[PDB]
């Protein structure tokens, strides 16, 4: 029955081998999904081996886009998968880093809190990490105690930087015993085309590397481009001393939302539940079956251009692409994304050549970005052509600069992008970096208000430049409306053209893609995809 006796909090560690980008985080999120559907209170955590105290200092070419929490911490991309699959808001405590651990221990040492002992990597650093892991088990603010804690160990087994985290995980297995701690290992099975064979040796070497630090995997996730033969799974199970139930073939699925089905079909969740002795019930597939219908059987299709610098074959825009697809799901339309380089759109002819075939354009935000002349050029072309545009953060800034160049302000720019501009229509109000959720008020019956169907909203922000209030009355002559603001009205939060000027061209300073979920699409992307559909139908 729905009510069960109390049991200790189970720890499930996910680790990676051979390489990064194996979908380790997505596999952990999908397992969290399945365990949630079986009725368990899953909570999740990530451990980042890098020394950056937070990824805000990084460049999106390193590990993709940054993410932001409601308590305002700045965290790795994987916390976004955790949100999108658990449909939850996670604390900043959900992302530990070596930078934070070392800073904490060094500070504690300077204060003498170790009573004159020699501070060492073992026990003190591993103790801090073990403390940070077991803190997840404590009852939440409302007393709800997690049934399973899924911890993802970033990096690769054998990286020098992972050594303290894996030692902490080993000590947790020692303290709590095997009945509470489960190790899931994700590994790569490469295909060599010239000889037409899958090779298990990389997996064997990775499992041996893991054993060399005192960890025995309970299951293996064999990432591959094609379904692994049964003979190879038997060979791997034999060589790696893993139960043949625990070798899980995980081929590249057409979309990330099929992964829960793949793992359920292989009975990974059943294996984990049996091994950890958790109480369970069957998965109610109703919701996710509807989602997968919206994914695989859409009624129509639409093409959207994604314009950026990182677009050169990188997942720097993962949240934006997923929010776009969720918007398509709300309308049961397939959204096809055309990855367009910003710099090909600097010339009007180049912009026409790039964009002429699409049904909409998206200008996402970024940091360390350059060359926004191409972005604004794409805006100018799209407005003339009638394509819908959604601008996120920098997209709104480029929209405002386009409007500035529409009314007389030809040399106008951001102080970020031309410090010598005579018309800094975008300027520092380095100023206060706005981070996290803030409330905003919307113009009644604005296109933004028509989308949200409310006058009050809250959105996650990450930026420090703002619209210069000195130019509102000048740029309003473009027809642009400051249709959403901070509650005091001091800060512009949304801009749009009236529908009769262009059917839909909207920008927002915030990152709404960080509040979207596939089963709860965000209003603005529903609106943007609807406008793109209307363009395609009317064109």
Ligand X SMILES: Nc1ncnc2c1ncn2[C@@H]1O[C@H](COP(=O)(O)OP(=O)(O)O)[C@@H](O)[C@H]1O
Ligand Y SMILES: O=P(O)(O)Oc1cc[n+]([C@@H]2O[C@H](COP(=O)(O)OP(=O)(O)OP(=O)(O)O)[C@@H](O)[C@H]2O)c(O)n1
Annotated binding-site ranges for Mg(2+): 78, 152
Binding of ligand Y by 261 (CB under 6 A): no
Q: Which of 264, 393, 461, 496 is flagged as catalytic?
A: 393
Question: What does 201 bind: ligand Y, ligand X, its own copies, none (CB cut-off 5 to 8 Å by kind)?
Answer: ligand Y
Choices 18-26, 275-283, 401-409, 431-439; region in contact with ligand X by CB under 6 A: 18-26
**What are the structure tokens assigned to 323, written together?**
């929010």
Is 345 a residue of the active site? no
Residue 385 tokens read as 């052509």
Closest-CB residue for ligand X?
23
237: helix, strand or coil: helix
Q: What is the DSSP letter of 489?
A: S
Kindly identify the residues of this chain, within the stretch 75-114, that bind ligand Y according to CB under 6 A.
Answer: 78
**According to the binding rule CB under 8 A, does residue 139 interact with its own copies?**
no
Using DSSP, state whether 397 is helix, strand or coil: helix
Residue 19 makes contact with ligand Y by CB under 6 A: yes
Q: Which stretch binds ligand X (CB under 6 A): 241-249, 253-261, 299-307, 375-383?
A: 253-261
Instruction: Give the footprint of ligand X on residues 59-118 (CB under 6 A).
Output: 78, 81
The annotated binding site for ATP is made up of: 21-26, 78, 253
- Regarding 206 and contact with ligand Y (CB under 6 A), the answer is no
- Residue 201 engages ligand Y in binding (rule: CB under 6 A): yes
Residue 496 designated active-site: no
Task: Count the neighbouring beta carbons within 10 Å of the beta carbon of residue 6.
Answer: 6
Q: Is 393 a catalytic residue?
A: yes
Least Å distance between CB 494 and its own copies? 46
3-state secondary structure of 224: strand
What number of residues does the chain have? 539
Contacts of 245 (CB under 8 A, 6+ apart): 219, 267, 271
- 20 touches ligand Y by CB under 6 A: yes
Smallest gap from residue 52 Cβ to ligand Y (A):
8
CA dihedral 205, 211, 215, 217 (to 10 degrees): 50
Q: Within 10 A of 190 (CB to CB), how many other CB atoms are there?
A: 16
Alpha helices in 241-317, H assignment, sequence order: 259-265, 268-276, 286-296
Please report whether residue 224 would count as binding ligand X according to CB under 6 A. Answer: no
By CB under 8 A, is residue 361 in contact with its own copies? no
Q: Which residue number, 322 or 493, has a Cβ lying nearer to ligand X? A: 322
CA distances from 111 to 105, 107, 115, 489 (A): 10, 6, 9, 46
Nearer to its own copies, 126 or 319 (CB): 126
C-alpha–C-alpha distance, residues 365 and 354, integer Å = 20
Asked if 426 and 467 touch (Cβ cutoff 8 Å), the reply is yes
Please, which residue, 11 or 24, has the CB nearer to ligand Y?
A: 24
What does the H/E/C string look like for 356-408? CCCCCEEECCCCCCCCHHHHHHHHHHHHHHCCCEEEECHHHHHHHHHHHHHHC
Whole-angstrom distance, CA of residue 153 vs CA of residue 469: 46
Q: According to the binding rule CB under 6 A, does residue 250 interact with ligand X?
A: yes
Q: Which helix (H) or strand (E) holds 308?
A: strand 300-308
Residue with smaller CB distance to ligand X, 78 or 180: 78
The least distance separating ligand X from the CB of residue 255, rounded to whole angstroms, comes to 7
| Interface with ligand Y in residues 141-160 (CB under 6 A) | 154-155, 159
Give the Cβ contact number of residue 70 at 10 Å: 15
Would you tell me which residues interact with its own copies (CB under 8 A)? Answer: 1, 3-5, 122-123, 174, 211-214, 216, 238-239, 241, 243-245, 247-248, 264, 266-267, 270, 274, 277, 279-283
Q: Which amino acids are annotated catalytic?
A: 393, 511, 513
Would you tell me which residues interact with ligand Y (CB under 6 A)? Answer: 16, 19-20, 24-25, 48-50, 63, 78, 154-155, 159, 161-162, 199-201
């Amino acid at each position: 029955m729905r009510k069960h006796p109390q049991t200790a909090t189970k720890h499930l560690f996910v680790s990676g081998g051979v390489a990064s980008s194996l979908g380790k985080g997505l596999t952990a999120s999908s397992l969290g999904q399945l365990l949630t559907a079986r009725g368990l209170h899953v909570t999740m955590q990530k451990l980042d081996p890098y020394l950056n105290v937070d990824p805000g200092t990084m460049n999106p070419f390193q590990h993709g886009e940054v993410f932001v929490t409601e308590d305002g911490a700045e965290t790795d991309l994987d916390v976004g998968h955790y949100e999108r699959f658990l449909d939850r808001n996670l604390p900043g405590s959900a992302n530990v880093t070596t930078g934070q651990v070392y800073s904490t221990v060094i500070a504690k040492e300077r204060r003498g809190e170790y009573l004159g002992d020699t501070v060492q990597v073992i026990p003190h650093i591993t103790d801090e990490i073990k403390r940070r892991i077991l803190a997840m088990a404590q009852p939440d603010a409302d007393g709800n105690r997690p049934d399973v804690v899924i911890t993802e160990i970033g990096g690769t087994v054998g990286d020098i930087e992972s050594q303290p985290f894996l030692e902490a995980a080993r000590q947790v297995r020692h303290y709590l015993g095997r009945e509470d701690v489960f190790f899931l290992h994700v590994s790569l099975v490469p295909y060599l085309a010239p000889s037409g064979e899958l090779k298990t040796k990389p997996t064997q070497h990775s499992v041996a590397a893991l054993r060399s630090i005192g960890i025995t995997p309970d299951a293996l996730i064999l990432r591959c481009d094609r379904d692994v033969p049964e003979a190879l799974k038997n060979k791997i199970a034999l060589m790696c001393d893993v139960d043949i139930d625990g070798v899980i073939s995980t081929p590249d699925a057409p979309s990330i939302y099929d992964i829960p089905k793949v793992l359920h079909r292989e009975e990974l969740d059943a294996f984990v539940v049996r091994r950890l002795n958790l109480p369970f019930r069957d998965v109610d597939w109703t919701e996710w079956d509807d989602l997968l219908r919206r994914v695989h059987e859409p009624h129509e299709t639409v093409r959207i251009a994604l314009v950026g610098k990182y677009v050169e074959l990188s997942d720097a825009y993962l949240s934006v692409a997923e929010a776009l697809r969720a918007g398509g799901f709300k309308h049961r339309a397939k959204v096809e994304i055309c990855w367009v380089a910003s710099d090909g759109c600097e010339t009007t002819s180049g912009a026409a050549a790039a964009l002429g075939d699409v049904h909409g354009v998206l200008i996402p935000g970024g940091f360390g970005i350059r060359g926004i002349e191409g972005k604004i050029g794409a805006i100018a072309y799209a407005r003339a052509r009638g394509l819908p545009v959604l601008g996120l953060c920098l997209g709104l800034q480029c929209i405002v600069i386009e409007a500035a160049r529409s009314v007389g302000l030809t040399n106008a720019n951001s102080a970020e992008f031309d410090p010598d501009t005579p018309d800094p229509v975008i300027a520092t109000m380095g100023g206060t970096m706005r981070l996290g959720s803030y409330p905003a008020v919307l113009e009644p019956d604005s296109v933004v208000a028509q989308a949200y169907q409310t006058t009050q909203v809250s959105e996650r922000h990450r930026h420090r430049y703002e619209v210069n209030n000195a130019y509102r009355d000048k740029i309003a002559e473009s027809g642009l409306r400051f249709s959403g603001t901070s509650p005091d009205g001091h800060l512009v939060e949304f801009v749009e053209y009236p529908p009769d000027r262009h059917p839909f061209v909207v920008g927002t300073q915030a990152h709404p893609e960080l509040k979207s979920r596939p089963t709860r699409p965000h209003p603005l992307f529903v609106a943007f995809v609807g406008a793109a559909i209307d363009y395609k139908a009317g064109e």
